[PDB]
Structures are given as C-alpha cells and as structure tokens.
C-alpha cells in the first residue's frame, strides 16, 4: 500500500499484548515490477518521517458505398 504507516498499522494486528508466538511477516513484492518503486517510495515516505520521530522521543479511399 502507498501508506507505510498503514502497512505498519496492519502488520501489528497479531503482534500485540497476548501474542504467544513469534510474528513472522511475509510481504509479497513482485520482482521486476512497478511494485518495486512503490516500496522504495514507501521507504521514502517512511524515512522522511522516522528520522524526526526518533529525535522527538529522545529530545478507405475510392470505396464509396452507394
């Protein structure tokens, strides 16, 4: 999805309080595809945001019919 935090929002469905097993995420990305750019753009929107959040918490012709 073109929204990484929504991707983050969705993934943690099973990884919360009460999860008694290891959460094993398997994202499907198509090789040699445009999906490669979305994820890179998804990373682009991710890192423009994570960098500051981490600082915040720390500080035809002639064919007539007729």
């Amino acid at each position: 999805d073109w929204n990484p935090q929504a991707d983050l929002q969705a993934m943690d469905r099973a990884h919360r309080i009460g999860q008694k097993k290891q959460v094993k995420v398997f994202r499907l990305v198509t090789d040699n595809s445009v999906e490669e750019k979305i994820l890179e753009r998804a990373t682009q929107k991710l890192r423009l945001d994570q960098l500051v959040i981490q600082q915040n918490r720390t500080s035809n012709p002639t064919k007539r019919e007729r």
Binding site: N60, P61, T62, K63, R64, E65
Partner: protein, 93 residues
C-alpha cells in the same frame, strides 16, 4: 457587365466522368446554386471554428475539420484524403 459562375469548371468535370453527356441550363443553374451553398456551409463554420479557439487565421485543418462536421462518414473519409492529396500535390510543387 460580367457576372461569374462555375459551370465551365463543372463541365470539364462532367467530361471527366461522363465525356459524352449533356446537361440542361435548368440543371446548370442548379449546380451553380448547389456549389455556392456547399462553399457557404463550411465557409461559415471554419470561420466560426477560428473564433472558437481564439485563433486568427483560417487553414485547411479547419476546412478539414469543418468537412468532418458536415459530410457523412464514408464520404468524409474520401474527400479528406482528396483534400489531403491536393495540398500535398500543391505543397510538393
């Protein structure tokens, strides 16, 4: 005085399709009348056409386009090619 019409240019074309067919004056008046109209009908719209795009000089494209506005379908495809050929023949020499 001298008043002009199209019958002579008609009559060569007549002889181009029917080289041995006559035509009455009542008919010849009809063609002179007929051709004058068909000129006029397109002539206006293409003029209008220029106004529509705020452009200020009539070209063959507008004529081309204007013909597409009037003539039905298959015939339009014919003449537009013939319009295409002649200018190409004209522009080439």
């Amino acid at each position: 005085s001298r008043k002009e019409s199209y019958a002579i240019y008609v009559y060569k074309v007549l002889k181009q399709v029917h080289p041995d067919t006559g035509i009455s004056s009542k008919a010849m008046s009809i063609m002179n009348s007929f051709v004058n109209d068909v000129f006029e009908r397109i002539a206006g719209e293409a003029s209008r056409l220029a106004h529509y795009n705020k452009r200020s000089t009539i070209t063959s494209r507008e004529i081309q386009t204007a013909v597409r506005l009037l003539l039905p379908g298959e015939l339009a495809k014919h003449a537009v090619s013939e319009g295409t050929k002649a200018v190409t023949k004209y522009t080439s020499a």
